[PDB]
Amino acid sequence: SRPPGPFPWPLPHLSFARLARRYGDVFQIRLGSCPVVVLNGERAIRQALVQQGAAFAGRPPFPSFQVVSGGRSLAFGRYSERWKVQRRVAHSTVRAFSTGQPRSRRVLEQHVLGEARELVRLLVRGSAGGAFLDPAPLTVVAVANVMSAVCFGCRYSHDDAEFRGLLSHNEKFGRTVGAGSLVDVLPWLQRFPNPVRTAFRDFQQLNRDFYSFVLDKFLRHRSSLRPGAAPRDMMDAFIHTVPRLDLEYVPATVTDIFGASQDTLSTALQWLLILFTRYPEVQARVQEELDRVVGRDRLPCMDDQPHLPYVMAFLYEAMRFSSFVPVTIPHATTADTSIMGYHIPKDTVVFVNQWSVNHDPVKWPNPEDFNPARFLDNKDLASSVMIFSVGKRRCIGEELSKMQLFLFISILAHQCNFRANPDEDSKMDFSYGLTIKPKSFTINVTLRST
Template identity: 30%
Template sequence: MTTVAVLFLLIWIIRRLYRIGSREPSLPPGPPTIPLLGNLNIFPAEYAHYKFTVWAREYGDIYSLKIGPSTVVVITSMGAVKELMDRRSGSTADRPPHYIADNVSGGLNMVLARYGDEWRILRKTAHAILSPSAVTAHLPIQVAEATQLMYDLLKSPERFYNHIRRYSNSVIMSVSYGKRCPRYETRETTSFFEAQHLWELALEPGAHPPIDLLPFLRHVPRRWAPWKILCDKTRKAQRELYFGLLDECNQRVQQGDENGCYMEEIIKRQDEFGLDRELRGYLGGVMIEGGSDTTSSFLQSLVLLLTAYPEVQRKGYEEIDRVIGDQRVPAIDDVPDLPYIQAIVKETHRMRPVAPLAVPHANREAETYKGHVIPKGSTIFMNTWGIYHDPDVYEDPETFNPDRYMHNEHGTKANLDTSNFNRADIAFGSGRRICPGMHLANNSLLLNTMNFIWAFTFGHAVDSRTGQPIPVDLFSYHKGILTAPKAFQCKITCRSLRHAQIIEKEFRKAIPTFERFEGNLSAEDEAWLKATRQ
């Protein structure tokens, strides 16, 4: 009898183990699973949005993956986003457990934090200080920094990649902490991009073992756990920058030497918002992350696409020359009169979304959609790349064609039913997790797109040995949860002497705006400013 009991126990255990990783009948369909692993063996370790999109074409706009006993749901349609991520945002606004992210930020990164009291405090504060009216107050420094970007491109166009990064970082540093970065070599700028590169490597889907699924991996010794070393390096780099800036800003407030930046307001209202030092430091850090890397990635993709599609430039010139002319620089008030420039911005979002899989959500309650059950605690990926590259929705989706947005606000095929489209784009996320800095970001994207088209031509660089144009690779992008084109060559030329003269003049006029944000700079930065402004 003992032998029989043991045999039945073994059979029961084997059957239970065999079921782990299998797809429950109520789930959306998906790739075949194998025992224990589910789909872990085929989960892409890099550039996951490509494989997710291939599976979407096979299994539909909602499908599931099994990662051991856990469930991942991938949605690849505007209708699914509208229903699940926007209308049911109260349920789907959570984030999945993320050991690596929590190990780096202590669970206080607003973008990745779980749905709870601390996240609500951070979100409420961010929305209070990043309102459309508050953003308008910071427009002067955005315009000034966009002017310097034109000036930098005029003087050393070959360094465009880093000029763009400096611009995006300096804007958000000025707006958030009241301290600008006049050069790419400014310590805070280089420190940020070094820390951000580590952070993106840490967050890349599929790049590390499934620690949240297999908690015993947390106990693996450091010498066999490269992700632990990466976490430590990332945490150290972030904290040195974010809390150093916070302390500097706090000192400025105590001395009464304020310049109107966001963190000054947060420091003065910290009790009202319920923010301790840790929350203040990571809120400021998230604003820098959100305003630096995403904006620079978008603008680098814009340059890449303009280089590859000269006919888009020509159409942009026609519109901007008609509306603006060559006697002044564009202004944010010109945007309503520039529909093709707006279309270029929308098409860049569509063609090369900065976050091709957004940031994964998790649902706090079980949900039903199209007859399928999404279990409580499932990880939900919004496949932005797949949505924007769906050939059933967009005509020739692999072509950069802003004209599609001149025909209708969604850029979709003619006569396509768009009633389930919630808005024109999903580049800034969805539901309660939508980016609170989207108004600030939109101003940067529109200002610089107008400026780029008004001031410059973007063409292929020429090989000095062969004399042949150097093609640009539209798929050469960095890995990570946020993607940007790898450094590439192109030829940037000012459109005329008159344009160059206006850029020089506007740069000189912007100096008083810059000076408000140039306290406590390094000796190297001070020397550079003196040489540049002679």
Template identity: 30%
Template sequence: MAAAEFWASLVGENMILQTTLVLLLVFFATSWFFSNPRNLPPGPRGWPVVGNFFSLANEHRHLTFNDWAKTYGPIYRVNLGGQKMVVLSGYDVIQEALARTGDDFSSRPFNAIFKIINPRRLGIATAPFGTPWKEHRRFTLKSLREFGFGKRNMEGKILEESVAFQAEILKMGDRPFDISRMVQNAVTNVICSLVFGSRFEYTDEKFTRLMDAFDRGFHFNFFTQLGVFFPTLRHLPGMGKGPKLIKEVLGTFRSHIKEELDSHKETFDPNDMRDLIDSYIRENKSRENDNETSFTDEYAECVLFDMFVAGTETTSTTLYWVFLYLVLNPDIQRKVQEEIHSVFGHDRPPSTAHRAQMPYTEAFLTELGRAATIAPTSVYRAASRDTSFHGYHIPEGTTVVALLWSVHYDPEHFPNPEKFDPGRFLDAQGQYRKDDHVIPFGVGSRICLGKNLAEMELFIIVTSLLQHFTFKLPEGAPKPSTIGINGASHAATKFELVAEPLA
């Protein structure tokens, strides 16, 4: 009798366990079903919990995105650890979404990494679409224009930096060297002159500390990415390194910005406006009695941080690609130099006033923007509201990835896209031919704030350096790869070169 009762009890417990498991399965399946809006775009299958993370946790994720577009079409869905992302591929789709229906896709996601970088969602770069973002973007652009942003009188500051750059190159003699730190120094000093009103000497201790922070940050390996995107894993050994590193690097920049802001307050003179910080101090003072204003010191620090980091990282990365393609293509370098010398000679400082007379140089820089594509997935957008796009439902807050790589490496528009060829942008008469399919700065209302400055910097620095130097690979050195690495941007792999002064 006892045995019968035991088996009956065991069967009953198993039935309860099975029923519980079935109910849990039904619960999770139902939750998943109702938490996933219907009529989303198609996309690749993913793993439970992590989604498609393992397919994207590599240094060439833009190529994975591009391959998926060939399978699932120009609009598809991926899942990154529970975060739904819609990927837009191809020029027509990206242009329609971001330019023609731009307000629908003009926000920023609040994902794991943005929560680390900007938890209060202030500033411009990672702030959501809305009134504060519009006000500060408009105000920042207006203020920067007062200090020459995008105007020819800005050329003097860029030329000053180019002369300092040349002096550093001359110190290297005929020795091979990695030019990346010099590039960072020069580009950072240009943005410093606009934001802080002055430049640094390259040997300045504070400046060196800031540049070291650039080198330490924004480069994530696989395990670092796991800790960044999956907060629960940060408690495991080694997994908390990524978020900790990001916070340390951001802390270095923000401490410097706060010091500059405090110092400017002490010497502020409304009759002598020196830079963007002074503009913000003046504006903040004018709104002191407005309890609803977003013009506060905290917001100003975030905007200044956005300008400082974005203005340095993207342009320095692009300029480093310039040197890579120059040493790999000596014939192209020679043609650019010939054009520079025909227009400016060997001593007259270059100026954008003569840019129209330099079609080959213009074509070279355009091809550089296409081939390098330093933001292959652009800066992630987010749907500003529930949106219907090409028959698909895209809920508010959904991360939107504009795959610029798919535009720049479209073989239908750019035959043999892997080849570096400025001739793509020259007509039969050798004149420059603009192509709207080259969009390295993005499109729409979130287009890069520093586009005009970056274009001016690249033109002035490249022409002034090639006016005085020829850049070559060291004797016997293997050719560096043109396959970039994804970190904060799509960066060229490290290489060394030799700078040969021109007589």
């Protein structure tokens, strides 16, 4: 009555496809001490998260998830009548900046082009001569600075000590999440001294310390915001949006907002850049379009988003091709329910394999081939690209990140031409972990004319 019996796992998102190509689109595995249901087909995923949304809108009660954002994290909070309220106002407030309305063209846009302009500088200048440089560190800083200005209005300068403290936080966080995830499925590691416990204890103090940082900006904001003024950033907007929830939920969602923003947008920029170098034809087609729609005396902006159907097509498939978020945040069942004729008890840990969707040869004919033209005359097969999830837990920053990413590649593609390194293999290897990042690579960025 239940899906193929738990197979001890590990024997990562690819192994899941290997066992989905043997025991069907839905199977179970024993993960350390936790039993997990893996969904792979789009049928299984859409039928679970969309048609049976409420039944799957939950989250496990993992140790990792408890200290993040001071316990009121939206990304990891359980499914509650109060979480539903948080999500509703969270999603609505952050998409208010995705749009082209006044709010958005004030906070997001001119901070993005402000940092994009700064980034093409450091690239063009870092490749001076025939020099080559690794762009990955510059995508982390760029993404951290933009969301800094978006959540607290503070667009730091790369000298700033407070900013070098944010970058340092993000690094330590990425270096200890592994330990946190290991304590989630092997909780017996908190019983005796070990490296994972020391790293997990470091993990949790890291979150306490950073949520403390965000909660400081919350007061200085609330203390300083006159009642008739429009929001200077996204924490002002959340202050204005105030069952009902504690005042402390405001900085908790703003910590989630900044947090989930870092490694994801960083990883995306790295994919967009390496793809330009390994696929010069699309680089040429992309930028040449920007000329026909933006000219050559002004940097692109949000007003050009609809008149640039290809730059988005290049984005929508960059996401499909890499699927750098191959598995969403673990889900949990709110009650007993059915999937593909399989019984699922309540409170079961369920994984969601997005990579299986974006690489099922049936759905996308030649999945391992890069061709943005898939999404062109598109409108609603770009919504089939599953890099953000679907259902009640779908990313609340979907539209904010494709709007922010677009501006980055448009300003970058508008100003410069990106060249690969000849000493490097024409192939793109993949670096797995947290996200699927392109293994270290070099590029030479030059200022173009056309």
